[PDB]
Write a protein that binds this ligand. Structure first.
Ligand SMILES: Cc1cc2nc3c(=O)[nH]c(=O)nc-3n(C[C@H](O)[C@H](O)[C@H](O)COP(=O)(O)OP(=O)(O)OC[C@H]3O[C@@H](n4cnc5c(N)ncnc54)[C@H](O)[C@@H]3O)c2cc1C
Ligand SMILES: Cc1cc2nc3c(=O)[nH]c(=O)nc-3n(C[C@H](O)[C@H](O)[C@H](O)COP(=O)(O)OP(=O)(O)OC[C@H]3O[C@@H](n4cnc5c(N)ncnc54)[C@H](O)[C@@H]3O)c2cc1C
Ligand SMILES: CCOC(=O)c1ccccc1S(=O)(=O)NC(=O)Nc1nc(Cl)cc(OC)n1
Ligand SMILES: CCOC(=O)c1ccccc1S(=O)(=O)NC(=O)Nc1nc(Cl)cc(OC)n1
Ligand SMILES: C/C(NCc1cnc(C)nc1N)=C(/S)CCOP(=O)([O-])OP(=O)([O-])O
Ligand SMILES: C/C(NCc1cnc(C)nc1N)=C(/S)CCOP(=O)([O-])OP(=O)([O-])O
Ligand SMILES: [Mg+2]
Ligand SMILES: [Mg+2]
Ligand SMILES: [Mg+2]
Ligand SMILES: [Mg+2]
Ligand SMILES: [Mg+2]
Lengths: 582, 582
């Protein structure tokens, strides 16, 4: 039973209705940056005792923080911005949350209704702008629609395939007094009828049937399984099928397990891509068959019966035509198949040890390899040390680039929602604010931002947010003085011709630039730089043991390449297993 | 006669056609940030000897730099970004350039044509997103359309009412070889027929007629006069009409002149708003009648014959219905009226000294006033010192907030395109990157960023750009530890209830946070902080005399308010002339 701060017959500002609507949704944390068109909302936020605001230094940092809050908890992330430039600064985050299916609710202020369309001060048609990069958006035209729209927004952002929902609120609606009707019925008749049903036993038994008939089965696990950790693990015990995970599904099945094929795809392991290439049954659970994973669609699992389970009917058969499909919650589908596999255990006699050995041979012959050059710190080894000293229990957020892939390869995530990384959009500057949101969602957790010197500096202003909010955010900065991922493609396909990929100072060419330690110093964050590989273990240990925020500038040779690499649009026979920029 | 780097019969990559298309447009500087979908363009940029790339650290910094390049030169600014997150990071700049009518050409990379619509890697419908916040945009579907689209883009961005034009280029189009046809005809038949004609002598003589019949004429000069500096000055000699300028038109008529009413509007001087309130002839040249200037439209120039000259027919009569209108270039309209006023000089006998004295009385009774508290540095006085030591010849870019208004009030700009500030959108984080673009456009000029501690930190990452590019950018940081403009509205209309407007550290409440000097130190920029008013003159002099970049942290008491202030939607009789937050 909810307790309001106002009488049931007492009129209150629309902004106070908006905030209370968040309270009834269980919202404890918001990332709001104030502005002229949203001052009423910020005033109403101070009157709330249950909602905490984490003030960022940039609205892109605010929405990225809401993402980290969401990806690392399963809750929806809530960011609030003002009209005009405040709203447009959320755009990268909205498109990011859409492509990665992150539950997110963005509230933007707006000019008064009579000023809309008149090119008013700090006015942009944010609804018209964001319609193609959100799951849905609203323009509140009456104060009485606030309780219904906010309920629909949270329902749409979290149910089905999650995504971002933007709610544009004009200033006059925030000031207008009203008595909210919390018993309103949502106007989502078509969307709720389109919601998938629990999976039938008919479809589930045909899948278990195909599992017994198969001799080379591979699990293709993606971001749709982040809530099916236990159900997937139980499913693997009953089948023994190896698990190949995507960049988004990392942690769903423990990466340190003997049945784990780790990540597959363009920068996936050689054995994971081998398993899918030579499989006869591909169990695609919670994936969307991205070109980063498949490459050439005709050659991806070219001799496999493809079972695809997805809660979005639009994804089933979009890129890869499956044999058997199940449109519904993969969590329920695993529960139904676990009871079938458990009762009919002795009837099926499932044993794929021959197929597993065929893959375990590939593990030994083509594992994840990195080269150590003298005393220079290899970034892969730096991440592996972070895995050890944290026991694989840390929440890892990353930027985008070489360091993002190495954080995916050389860290063994044991649970889902430990791995926070922009996959679909691939937005740099994501790691640091996402670490902020993850730490507020998980205060007693180890949050480490494995960032790159290009990505880190983009939203470096959020270091101020980390200190002011006193968040124990660790920044493992893998500094290579380059836009490494773009530099790697320059070495491979453009004869190492540098096209504006060096981030340092050409005058002082051998000096590390900028001095990221002084960025942390400016915001009162203790920092340190480690260059020699011997000091690396003690440096990372100091970062973890030192309470509060900490930045560790880990210098790395820039000639490193992410391996292995399947070129874009290529097949498994085009995999690059060796080579760098030397 | 243009000289190509390729034979007229030699095939070349579409990216090389794109870059050469820029060369034929006279483009010398671009602000490009590389990414996977635009690597071909960046490779083609290195082959160009005439086009320089200024690599920012954030694409929002890139587009804002293109704005400063444009507003401070009259040329179009050119920014280039990759697909997905690179493109979405341009959004705030595009909407900014649209509302302020800044000539700007944005080029975004895109996934290959066959991948569009498939939710591909780093794909966003940037054309669908930006259609409502650009003058026009394109999606290049064939390599042969590049020479025509780039020509149309620059023509649309610069002709008529300027604005931003985005050109989305897929990756396969950049790689495809072709022989460009530079003699292509632009497909803009309706837009060119809609282009305004030179003004008729019929309309111009009726204006001069109304000038002689008027006894209280006021000039309402805005951003449309930035290229009519001489024509407007000559027009004032022949009429003697006082000049009230907008936030965008600052510098069109010298602010230090005896006929200058300085800025009018919400935060405009008392005498400028008085002149418009009690005028009988309002010569609105190059304005759009913003609510920041008019407030309540019915009371704005309620007893004045309104002559409106604008190159956009959509603006004539949108908010304020005029008596006489001229749809065309105000530069030509002034030339035509100057010949009429010069020949018929003795016939007209123009003398408004009675009206000028009525205003000069208001200048003495209600001037721009600031209060000095002990030794605390008043920001107004700090800007006035910058005016002295630079002789009013510096290029000033600002953020958005209290410091933006004080930079508009207490600096006497002598020429147009010295004042670079986000007016319509009002985007924070604009000053520092715009200063970058202005310095590259005007290397031998004094470029000073009068930024606020909130705005400055948003795009603080561009300090690295300033050092790497060795730009003599001065940063006059007016640090008040608050979001001052939002704080001012809290004091006036919300009983000084702080709603997330303090930017410092609440733990160390009296410590200046963050330490902006260390931000400059991180990027190898010499910096200094001045707190006592006595040291202010020497500190600013050191900033100017020290070659290269320099950051000056000017600490100011946060209780200052921007005065005078006409509340939003109010009239002249509601002007607030005194008060602060103490
Ligand atoms: C530089 C870079 C390199 C990359 N290279 C790789 C790579 O090598 N390998 C790789 O895997 N990724 C890579 N990516 C990321 C890639 O772009 C995609 O993010 C990823 O390939 C696709 O993730 P996904 O298949 O799990 O689908 P997601 O984006 O995670 O979407 C989840 C899917 O499952 C469905 N779903 C969601 N919830 C449920 C539910 N409860 N029940 C049932 N279904 C549900 C959804 O409808 C959706 O289709 C890279 C990214 C970057 C930036
Ligand atoms: C915090 C804040 C406070 C502000 N308060 C004020 C204030 O007090 N006073 C103020 O003035 N502004 C203020 N503004 C800015 C305000 O929002 C607008 O930018 C400004 O009021 C309008 O500028 P403008 O009238 O010159 O039109 P512009 O935006 O500069 O547009 C130029 C107009 O002239 C036309 N035009 C362009 N070129 C030509 C040409 N060659 N020939 C003929 N016509 C042409 C265009 O069609 C257009 O209509 C403030 C901004 C902020 C961020
Ligand atoms: C930025 C807010 O925009 C608006 O809401 C707005 C826009 C156009 C006309 C009237 C209003 S209003 O009268 O409904 N409200 C304001 O104008 N608020 C406002 N807040 C701040 Cl902090 C500053 C400002 O102008 C400088 N104006
Ligand atoms: C980010 C570029 O996006 C694309 O162009 C793209 C998208 C989807 C499918 C194929 C391509 S592609 O084969 O036409 N080109 C690439 O995929 N380029 C690319 N560049 C970098 Cl530097 C990295 C990368 O994947 C990590 N991919
Ligand atoms: C520029 C770019 N990609 C294009 C790009 C541009 N801008 C954004 C916001 N996102 C992306 N993905 C990359 S992956 C460079 C990464 O550089 P980094 O942050 O220092 O990481 P690393 O050097 O390990 O590759
Ligand atoms: C938050 C805000 N306005 C809302 C806002 C939010 N975000 C952006 C990008 N732009 C704007 N205009 C202002 S004007 C605060 C200005 O703070 P400042 O940069 O330190 O300048 P000052 O303190 O002098 O007002
Ligand atoms: Mg289908
Ligand atoms: Mg790097
Ligand atoms: Mg009209
Ligand atoms: Mg930034
Ligand atoms: Mg400030």
């Amino acid at each position: 039973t909810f307790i309001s701060r106002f009488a049931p017959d007492q009129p209150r500002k629309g902004a106070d209705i908006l905030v209370e609507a968040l309270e009834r949704q269980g919202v404890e944390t918001v990332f709001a940056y104030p502005g002229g068109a949203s001052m009423e909302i910020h005033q109403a936020l101070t009157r709330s005792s249950s909602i905490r605001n984490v003030l960022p230094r940039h609205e892109q940092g605010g929405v990225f923080a809401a993402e980290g809050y969401a990806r690392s908890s399963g809750k929806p992330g809530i960011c609030i911005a003002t009209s005009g430039p405040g709203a447009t600064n959320l755009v990268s985050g909205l498109a990011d949350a859409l492509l990665d299916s992150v539950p997110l609710v963005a509230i933007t202020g707006q000019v008064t209704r009579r000023m809309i369309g008149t090119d008013a001060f700090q006015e942009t048609p944010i609804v018209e702008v964001t319609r193609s990069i959100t799951k849905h958006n609203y323009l509140v035209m009456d104060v009485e629609d606030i309780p219904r729209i906010i309920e629909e927004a949270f329902f749409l952002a979290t149910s089905g395939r999650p995504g971002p929902v933007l709610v544009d609120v004009p200033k006059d609606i925030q000031q207008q007094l009203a008595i909210p009707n919390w018993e309103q019925a949502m106007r989502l008749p078509g969307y709720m009828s389109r919601m998938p049903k629990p999976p039938e036993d008919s479809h589930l038994e045909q899948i278990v049937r195909l599992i017994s008939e198969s001799k080379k089965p591979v699990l293709y696990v993606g971001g749709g399984c982040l809530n099916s950790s236990d159900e997937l693990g139980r499913f693997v015990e009953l089948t023994g099928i190896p698990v190949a995970s995507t960049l988004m599904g990392l942690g769903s099945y423990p990466c340190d397990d003997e049945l784990s094929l780790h990540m597959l795809g363009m920068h996936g392991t050689v054995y994971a891509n081998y398993a899918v290439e030579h499989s006869d049954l591909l169990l695609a659970f919670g994936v969307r068959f991205d070109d980063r994973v498949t490459g050439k669609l005709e050659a991806f699992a070219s001799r496999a019966k493809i079972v695809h389970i997805d809660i979005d009917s639009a994804e089933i058969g979009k890129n890869k035509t499956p044999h058997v499909s199940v449109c519904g919650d993969v969590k329920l589908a695993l529960q139904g198949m676990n009871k079938v596999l458990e009762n009919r255990a002795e009837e099926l006699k499932l044993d794929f040890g021959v197929w597993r050995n065929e893959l375990n041979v590939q593990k030994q012959k083509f594992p994840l390899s990195f080269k150590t050059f003298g005393e220079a710190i290899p970034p892969q080894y730096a991440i592996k040390v972070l895995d050890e000293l944290t026991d694989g229990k840390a929440i890892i957020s990353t930027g985008v680039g070489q360091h993002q892939m190495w954080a995916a390869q050389f860290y063994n995530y044991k649970k889902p929602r430990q791995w926070l990384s922009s996959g679909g959009l691939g937005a740099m500057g994501f790691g640091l604010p996402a670490a902020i949101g993850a730490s507020v969602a998980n205060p007693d957790a180890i949050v480490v931002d494995i960032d790159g010197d290009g990505s880190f500096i983009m939203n470096v202003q959020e270091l101020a947010t980390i200190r002011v909010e006193n968040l124990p955010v660790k920044v493992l900065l893998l500094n290579n003085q380059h836009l490494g991922m773009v530099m790697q493609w320059e070495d491979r396909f453009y004869k190492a011709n540098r096209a504006h990929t060096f981030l340092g100072d050409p005058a002082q060419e051998d000096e590390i630039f900028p001095n990221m330690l002084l960025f942390a110093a400016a915001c009162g964050i203790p920092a340190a730089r480690v260059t020699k590989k011997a000091d690396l273990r003690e440096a990372i240990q100091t970062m973890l043991d030192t309470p509060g925020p900490y930045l560790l500038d880990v210098i790395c040779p820039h000639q490193e390449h992410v391996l292995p690499m399947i070129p874009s649009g290529g097949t498994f026979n085009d995999v690059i297993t060796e080579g760098d920029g030397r």
